[model samples]
Target: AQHDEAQQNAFYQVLNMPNLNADQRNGFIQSLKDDPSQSANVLGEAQKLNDSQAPK
Candidate 1:
């Protein structure tokens, strides 16, 4: 199986950000659809953001 739970969750978390409007969200979603490999990048970025937001 192509495990994508992390990617999917990360995508949702990133989209939940209030900073992104509808158009921007659509663009971001489309970009991910265009290149599924970007999901990993998104996950990395999301992890970075989460770490920065809640640094130990």
Candidate 2:
């Protein structure tokens, strides 16, 4: 289980490495925290990863 968790974490870590600017990562996390309900509206971003501030 530990190995699996570590692998999963590593996968996403590497996958998200391109967001080194911190803007993408910060915006994504901030959205979820700003409105937990907005998390469900993630489809709003599924096809538009760059528009994190877009209405949910």
Which one is best on TM-score? 1
The digit string of per-residue lDDT tens for model 2 on 1-56 reads 55555334433442354423466556655655565555545324522553444454
What lDDT does candidate 1 reach at residue 2? Answer: 75
lDDT at 40, model 1: 71
Query: For residues 1-56, could you state the per-residue lDDT of candidate 1 as single tens digits?
Result: 27788567757866775545576556666766776778877655544555565534
Each model's backbone clash number: 0, 0
Error of model 2, residue 5, in angstroms: 16
Pairs of residues at least 3 apart in sequence or in different chains that clash in candidate 1: none
The 10 consecutive residues of candidate 2 with the worst lDDT sum are 6-15
